[PDB]
Design a protein around this motif. Structure first.
Motif, PDB file in Angstrom:
ATOM      1  N   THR A 174      57.512  84.278  37.412  1.00 48.64           N
ATOM      2  CA  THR A 174      56.735  84.775  38.395  1.00 48.64           C
ATOM      3  C   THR A 174      55.426  84.016  38.566  1.00 48.64           C
ATOM      4  N   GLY A 191      51.080  85.016  39.776  1.00 51.00           N
ATOM      5  CA  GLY A 191      50.460  86.143  40.496  1.00 51.00           C
ATOM      6  C   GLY A 191      50.649  87.314  39.701  1.00 51.00           C
ATOM      7  N   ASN A 192      50.093  88.390  40.243  1.00 55.46           N
ATOM      8  CA  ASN A 192      49.990  89.488  39.428  1.00 55.46           C
ATOM      9  C   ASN A 192      51.103  90.724  39.618  1.00 55.46           C
ATOM     10  N   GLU A 193      52.050  90.097  40.238  1.00 63.72           N
ATOM     11  CA  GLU A 193      53.202  91.323  40.492  1.00 63.72           C
ATOM     12  C   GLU A 193      53.776  91.510  38.967  1.00 63.72           C
ATOM     13  N   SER A 194      54.262  92.836  38.842  1.00 66.67           N
ATOM     14  CA  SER A 194      54.674  93.069  37.496  1.00 66.67           C
ATOM     15  C   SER A 194      56.280  93.387  37.549  1.00 66.67           C
ATOM     16  N   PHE A 195      57.023  92.619  38.039  1.00 69.12           N
ATOM     17  CA  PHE A 195      58.266  92.910  38.235  1.00 69.12           C
ATOM     18  C   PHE A 195      59.024  91.668  38.898  1.00 69.12           C
ATOM     19  N   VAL A 196      60.475  91.634  38.515  1.00 67.82           N
ATOM     20  CA  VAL A 196      61.112  90.702  39.463  1.00 67.82           C
ATOM     21  C   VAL A 196      62.828  91.138  39.482  1.00 67.82           C
ATOM     22  N   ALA A 207      60.848  95.129  34.851  1.00 68.98           N
ATOM     23  CA  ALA A 207      59.447  95.532  35.427  1.00 68.98           C
ATOM     24  C   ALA A 207      58.690  95.781  34.382  1.00 68.98           C
ATOM     25  N   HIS A 211      51.200  95.345  33.287  1.00 68.61           N
ATOM     26  CA  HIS A 211      50.297  93.957  33.060  1.00 68.61           C
ATOM     27  C   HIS A 211      49.703  94.254  31.365  1.00 68.61           C
TER      28      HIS A 211
END
Length: 99
Positions: A55, A57-62, A22, A25
Protein backbone atom coordinates in the motif's frame (compact mmCIF):
# COMPACT_ATOMS: atom_id res chain seq x y z
CA UNK A 1 13.51 3.31 9.36
CA UNK A 2 10.26 1.94 10.82
CA UNK A 3 11.03 0.49 14.27
CA UNK A 4 7.78 -1.30 15.07
CA UNK A 5 5.26 -3.54 13.37
CA UNK A 6 1.63 -2.59 12.95
CA UNK A 7 -0.66 -3.91 15.68
CA UNK A 8 -4.27 -5.12 15.92
CA UNK A 9 -3.76 -7.06 12.71
CA UNK A 10 -6.83 -8.91 11.53
CA UNK A 11 -7.59 -11.02 8.47
CA UNK A 12 -11.24 -11.41 7.46
CA UNK A 13 -12.74 -13.73 4.86
CA UNK A 14 -14.76 -11.80 2.28
CA UNK A 15 -15.54 -14.18 -0.58
CA UNK A 16 -14.23 -17.12 -2.58
CA UNK A 17 -11.39 -14.90 -3.84
CA UNK A 18 -11.03 -12.02 -1.37
CA UNK A 19 -9.64 -11.51 2.12
CA UNK A 20 -9.55 -8.20 4.02
CA UNK A 21 -6.39 -7.43 6.01
CA UNK A 22 -6.52 -4.51 8.44
CA UNK A 23 -4.17 -3.12 11.03
CA UNK A 24 -3.51 -0.20 13.31
CA UNK A 25 -0.98 2.44 12.27
CA UNK A 26 2.32 2.67 14.09
CA UNK A 27 3.02 5.42 16.63
CA UNK A 28 4.80 8.34 14.94
CA UNK A 29 7.60 8.15 17.53
CA UNK A 30 8.39 4.74 15.98
CA UNK A 31 8.66 6.13 12.46
CA UNK A 32 6.61 7.44 9.55
CA UNK A 33 5.98 4.89 6.75
CA UNK A 34 5.47 5.54 3.06
CA UNK A 35 3.18 2.52 3.23
CA UNK A 36 2.82 -1.11 4.25
CA UNK A 37 3.74 -4.37 2.60
CA UNK A 38 1.44 -7.34 3.07
CA UNK A 39 3.01 -10.73 2.55
CA UNK A 40 0.62 -13.61 1.99
CA UNK A 41 0.97 -17.31 1.29
CA UNK A 42 -1.26 -20.36 0.99
CA UNK A 43 -1.08 -22.72 3.95
CA UNK A 44 -0.09 -25.66 1.74
CA UNK A 45 2.96 -23.70 0.55
CA UNK A 46 5.99 -22.21 2.33
CA UNK A 47 6.22 -18.69 3.72
CA UNK A 48 9.09 -18.27 1.25
CA UNK A 49 6.66 -18.49 -1.66
CA UNK A 50 4.81 -15.46 -0.30
CA UNK A 51 3.33 -12.94 -2.68
CA UNK A 52 3.42 -9.29 -1.64
CA UNK A 53 1.15 -6.29 -2.04
CA UNK A 54 2.27 -2.77 -1.10
CA UNK A 55 0.00 0.00 0.00
CA UNK A 56 1.00 3.60 -0.18
CA UNK A 57 -0.24 6.40 2.04
CA UNK A 58 -1.92 6.10 5.43
CA UNK A 59 -4.76 3.63 4.80
CA UNK A 60 -4.56 0.78 7.28
CA UNK A 61 -6.12 -2.02 5.25
CA UNK A 62 -6.08 -3.79 1.96
CA UNK A 63 -8.53 -6.12 0.27
CA UNK A 64 -6.52 -8.85 -1.41
CA UNK A 65 -8.06 -10.14 -4.61
CA UNK A 66 -7.63 -13.04 -6.99
CA UNK A 67 -7.12 -15.54 -4.19
CA UNK A 68 -7.65 -19.28 -4.50
CA UNK A 69 -11.08 -20.46 -3.35
CA UNK A 70 -11.59 -22.55 -0.20
CA UNK A 71 -8.01 -21.87 0.86
CA UNK A 72 -6.32 -21.10 4.19
CA UNK A 73 -4.04 -18.05 3.77
CA UNK A 74 -1.46 -16.58 6.13
CA UNK A 75 -0.51 -12.90 6.25
CA UNK A 76 2.05 -10.59 7.81
CA UNK A 77 2.25 -6.79 7.47
CA UNK A 78 5.24 -4.53 7.77
CA UNK A 79 5.78 -0.80 7.36
CA UNK A 80 8.30 0.49 4.83
CA UNK A 81 9.92 3.76 3.91
CA UNK A 82 13.01 4.96 2.06
CA UNK A 83 15.29 3.59 4.76
CA UNK A 84 13.88 0.05 4.59
CA UNK A 85 11.29 -2.35 6.00
CA UNK A 86 10.14 -2.43 9.60
CA UNK A 87 9.55 -5.62 11.54
CA UNK A 88 6.65 -7.86 10.49
CA UNK A 89 3.36 -8.05 12.38
CA UNK A 90 2.12 -11.10 14.19
CA UNK A 91 0.95 -13.59 11.58
CA UNK A 92 -2.80 -13.76 10.97
CA UNK A 93 -4.85 -16.24 8.94
CA UNK A 94 -8.19 -16.51 7.17
CA UNK A 95 -9.79 -18.84 4.65
CA UNK A 96 -11.43 -17.85 1.39
CA UNK A 97 -15.04 -19.01 1.06
CA UNK A 98 -16.29 -22.13 -0.71
CA UNK A 99 -18.52 -22.94 -3.62
Amino acid sequence: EPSAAPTDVKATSVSVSEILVAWKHIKESLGRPQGFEVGYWKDMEQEDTAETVKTRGNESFVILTGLEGNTLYHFTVRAYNGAGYGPPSSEVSATTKKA
